[PDB]
Write an enzyme that holds these catalytic residues in place. Structure first.
Site, PDB file in Angstrom:
ATOM      1  CG  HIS A 193       0.800  -4.257   5.462  1.00  0.00           C
ATOM      2  ND1 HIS A 193       0.447  -3.783   6.717  1.00  0.00           N
ATOM      3  CD2 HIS A 193       0.681  -3.226   4.597  1.00  0.00           C
ATOM      4  CE1 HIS A 193       0.130  -2.527   6.607  1.00  0.00           C
ATOM      5  NE2 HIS A 193       0.221  -2.158   5.314  1.00  0.00           N
TER       6      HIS A 193
ATOM      7  CG  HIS B 134       0.369   3.356   4.735  1.00  0.00           C
ATOM      8  ND1 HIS B 134      -0.379   3.090   5.868  1.00  0.00           N
ATOM      9  CD2 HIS B 134       0.493   2.180   4.089  1.00  0.00           C
ATOM     10  CE1 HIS B 134      -0.666   1.797   5.906  1.00  0.00           C
ATOM     11  NE2 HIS B 134      -0.123   1.213   4.840  1.00  0.00           N
TER      12      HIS B 134
ATOM     13  CG  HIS C 212      -4.667   1.831   3.461  1.00  0.00           C
ATOM     14  ND1 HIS C 212      -5.231   0.714   2.926  1.00  0.00           N
ATOM     15  CD2 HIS C 212      -3.853   1.402   4.463  1.00  0.00           C
ATOM     16  CE1 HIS C 212      -4.821  -0.355   3.564  1.00  0.00           C
ATOM     17  NE2 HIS C 212      -3.979   0.044   4.548  1.00  0.00           N
TER      18      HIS C 212
ATOM     19  CG  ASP D  40      -6.581   0.349  -1.083  1.00  0.00           C
ATOM     20  OD1 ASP D  40      -5.775   0.564  -0.160  1.00  0.00           O
ATOM     21  OD2 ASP D  40      -7.805   0.388  -0.912  1.00  0.00           O
TER      22      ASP D  40
ATOM     23  CG  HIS E 119      -1.657  -1.167   1.510  1.00  0.00           C
ATOM     24  ND1 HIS E 119      -1.604  -1.753   2.745  1.00  0.00           N
ATOM     25  CD2 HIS E 119      -2.409  -1.976   0.717  1.00  0.00           C
ATOM     26  CE1 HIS E 119      -2.312  -2.866   2.726  1.00  0.00           C
ATOM     27  NE2 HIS E 119      -2.829  -3.031   1.495  1.00  0.00           N
TER      28      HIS E 119
ATOM     29  NE  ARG F 199       1.212   0.812   9.243  1.00  0.00           N
ATOM     30  CZ  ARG F 199       0.669   2.022   9.127  1.00  0.00           C
ATOM     31  NH1 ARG F 199       1.402   3.100   8.909  1.00  0.00           N
ATOM     32  NH2 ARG F 199      -0.642   2.144   9.222  1.00  0.00           N
TER      33      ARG F 199
ATOM     34  CG  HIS G  21      -8.787  -1.775   2.020  1.00  0.00           C
ATOM     35  ND1 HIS G  21      -7.554  -1.242   1.723  1.00  0.00           N
ATOM     36  CD2 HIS G  21      -8.670  -3.101   1.869  1.00  0.00           C
ATOM     37  CE1 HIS G  21      -6.751  -2.228   1.406  1.00  0.00           C
ATOM     38  NE2 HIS G  21      -7.400  -3.352   1.491  1.00  0.00           N
TER      39      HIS G  21
ATOM     40  CG  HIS H  83      -8.165   3.206   0.761  1.00  0.00           C
ATOM     41  ND1 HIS H  83      -7.803   2.181   1.672  1.00  0.00           N
ATOM     42  CD2 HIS H  83      -9.333   3.745   1.180  1.00  0.00           C
ATOM     43  CE1 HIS H  83      -8.721   2.183   2.645  1.00  0.00           C
ATOM     44  NE2 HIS H  83      -9.647   3.137   2.375  1.00  0.00           N
TER      45      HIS H  83
END
Ligand SMILES: [Cu+2]
Ligand SMILES: [Cu+2]
Ligand SMILES: [Zn+2]
Ligand SMILES: [Zn+2]
Lengths: 153, 153
Positions: free
Chosen positions: A120, A48, A63, A83, A46, A143, A71, A80
């Protein structure tokens, strides 16, 4: 021809380099490179919101979601901006990344330069999971590594 | 309104956190924070062109110089956009950074978000050193620590 790059580092063994290329203003962005030190399987991937690594990857916030959507996965209308789904690591713990995305950009209000790329702990369920956290984070857990997306030569 | 942040990392450890704040897009940028692990004295302090740390701080390229000018100090008309002069470390090796600059920006053509902040081995001579390198790098020598400038909350 706009180019960007991101060095992923964390507290553990996860390290990666991810490249971005966007030929045209409001054209697709090619995303490619390699991440190592991963457990075999899917890892949520992702953009962020904040390019803030003050206290590590947690400082990057949620996100990147400039359009206030739920999401989802990259192929969903409801996602997002940040994403980018999952990267998949093999038994060697390596994920080869070759993505094209038309929602992210390297300029304008969808611009990801100066934001944080995060890989992640777990799979992103692309918002299709059996709980409320599916449609906020995809349940991708902690993370493992991150970095600020910078302008590249 | 506009905020940015940068984590400086390099061998020492040379470790810094530098904050940027710009109330107004036509306004000056306040730059503040702390860098530890430095040798007592002046260290050159610049924004470099690329937010690329793929091979370390060398990947960031030359001073950010969108207007094709010569190197100077921050107070000079003739300067690179990236020329923020020197930070000064104490005998404890700590540089307390408190800078206001009206040439860098957190938006538009002089935007430094997604570029690399670098603290250098030696003093920047602010282009007043005579020799040809003074007008290009300020003779500030190697790159001790750097990070990509990211958008902050
Ligand atoms: Cu994420
Ligand atoms: Cu420099
Ligand atoms: Zn999301
Ligand atoms: Zn310069």
């Amino acid at each position: 021809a706009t180019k960007a790059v991101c060095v992923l580092k964390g507290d553990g063994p996860v390290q990666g380099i991810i490249n971005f290329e966007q030929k045209e203003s409001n054209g697709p962005v090619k995303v490619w490179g390699s991440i190592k030190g991963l457990t075999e399987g899917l890892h949520g991937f992702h953009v962020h919101e904040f390019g803030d690594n003050t206290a590590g990857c947690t400082s990057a916030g949620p996100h990147f979601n400039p359009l206030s959507r739920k999401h989802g996965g990259p192929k969903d209308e409801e996602r997002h901006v940040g994403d980018l789904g999952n990267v998949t690591a093999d038994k060697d713990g390596v994920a080869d990344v070759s993505i094209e995305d038309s929602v992210i950009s390297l300029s304008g209000d969808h611009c990801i330069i100066g934001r944080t790329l995060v890989v992640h702990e777990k799979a992103d369920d692309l918002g299709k999971g059996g709980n409320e956290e599916s449609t906020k984070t995809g349940n991708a857990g902690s993370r493992l590594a991150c970095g600020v997306i910078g302008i590249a030569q």
